[PDB]
Design a protein around this ligand. Structure first.
Ligand SMILES: N[C@@H](CCCC[NH3+])C(=O)O
Ligand SMILES: O[C@@H]1[C@@H](O)[C@H](O)OC[C@H]1O
Ligand SMILES: O[C@@H]1[C@@H](O)[C@H](O)OC[C@H]1O
Ligand SMILES: O[C@@H]1[C@@H](O)[C@H](O)OC[C@H]1O
Ligand SMILES: CC(C)[C@H](N)C(=O)O
Ligand SMILES: [Ca+2]
Ligand SMILES: [Ca+2]
Ligand SMILES: [Ca+2]
Ligand SMILES: [Ca+2]
Ligand SMILES: [Zn+2]
Length: 316
């Protein structure tokens, strides 16, 4: 909507107070005009018709419980945007400052969020397995990273190419969580997952096995469930990334860490220069290996670490 760019205030899912860029025209709409062509947040009103209604607020103050999911979705979408702009020199998910649209209050007790090819969609959770999922910055960045992939590598969402796609969203969802630096870890969804269980998460990049996911190519799931286990075998590529950045010894193979920032530059370049829709794990290794060579040279520690990490997880 047309209006004047102003700044509101509100509290998020986790009870933290934060400012949000809004637009005034009778009401105060969740419309962030300070970022690309806009970050718009909508209200699905507990239904599944998308996007819904561009969030309208009468006083620019968003402290009601019903406003919280919209606050985090509106706020954390801008954080992810900033991450891709400041770090990777990418303007929104399509590189041309595409508008970022998110719908909250999706359906009733919906325990999931997703990118539907055009927007992000957050459920409020059933209060037991999940609380509103926009509360997790890694969740928000995870889903917006799916948009970045759709516009770049375009990895099919099935089998190895899908696991890579999921792994990319887990990686850059974690790196955004660090980029914001508010209780950052190598776990996925800890901030919105099971409020009545202290210390657990949905997935674990550090130890995928913690929750039953493979951390080595031998233990990969080969059935049909989960589009071939895209949320399962992502652990193999999650672990590899966790080793590239943090380093360690995994099944006896030792990996020297190079840090998060370099992991990011490597995987982004792979995602935007060398990966294709049908890429597989072995092709992902090659993509990361070339990226690290372009960035730091063939005889560099970075290249060695990549080879060491994909070796540790059994990817040749
Ligand atoms: N995001 C993952 C896990 C969500 C938790 C189960 N609903 C998936 O959709 O597979
Ligand atoms: O209580 C909710 C209120 O916060 C919102 O503004 O409109 C819908 C209501 O259900
Ligand atoms: O507020 C209620 C909401 O919690 C539920 O999801 O759907 C019914 C609503 O009235
Ligand atoms: O997935 C497994 C989990 O269920 C168990 O509790 O601890 C070991 C894991 O491999
Ligand atoms: C819950 C979220 C991180 C995603 N839809 C899965 O995995
Ligand atoms: Ca208000
Ligand atoms: Ca965290
Ligand atoms: Ca996390
Ligand atoms: Ca928990
Ligand atoms: Zn995903």
């Amino acid at each position: 909507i047309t209006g004047t760019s102003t700044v509101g205030v509100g509290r998020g899912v986790l009870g933290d107070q934060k400012n949000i860029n809004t637009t005034y025209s009778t009401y105060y709409y969740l419309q962030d005009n300070t970022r690309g062509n806009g970050i718009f947040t909508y209200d699905a009103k507990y239904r599944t018709t998308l996007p819904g209604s561009l969030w309208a607020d009468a006083d620019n103050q968003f402290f009601a419980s019903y406003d919280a999911p919209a606050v985090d979705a509106h706020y954390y979408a801008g954080v992810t945007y900033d991450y891709y702009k400041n770090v990777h020199n990418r303007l929104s998910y399509d590189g041309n400052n595409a508008a970022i649209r998110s719908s909250v209050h999706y359906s009733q007790g919906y325990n999931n969020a997703f990118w539907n090819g055009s927007q992000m969609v957050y459920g409020d959770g059933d209060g037991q397995t999940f609380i509103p999922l926009s509360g997790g910055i890694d969740v928000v960045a995870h889903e917006l990273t799916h948009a970045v992939t759709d516009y770049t590598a375009g990895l099919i969402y099935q089998n190895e190419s899908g696991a890579i796609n999921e792994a990319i969203s887990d990686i850059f969802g974690t790196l955004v969580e660090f980029y914001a630096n508010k209780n950052p870890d190598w776990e996925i969804g800890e901030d919105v997952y099971t409020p009545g269980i202290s210390g657990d998460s949905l997935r674990s990049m550090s130890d995928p096995a913690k929750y039953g996911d493979p951390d080595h190519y031998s233990k990969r799931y080969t059935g049909t469930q989960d589009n071939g286990g895209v949320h399962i075998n992502s652990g193999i590529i999650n672990k590899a990334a966790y080793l590239i950045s943090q380093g360690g010894t995994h099944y006896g193979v030792s990996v020297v860490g190079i840090g998060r920032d370099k992991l990011g530059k490597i995987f982004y370049r792979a995602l935007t220069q060398y990966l294709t829709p049908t890429s597989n794990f072995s092709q992902l290794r090659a993509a990361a290996v070339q990226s690290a060579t372009d960035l730091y040279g063939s005889t560099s520690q970075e290249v060695a670490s990549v080879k060491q990490a994909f070796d540790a997880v059994g990817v040749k």
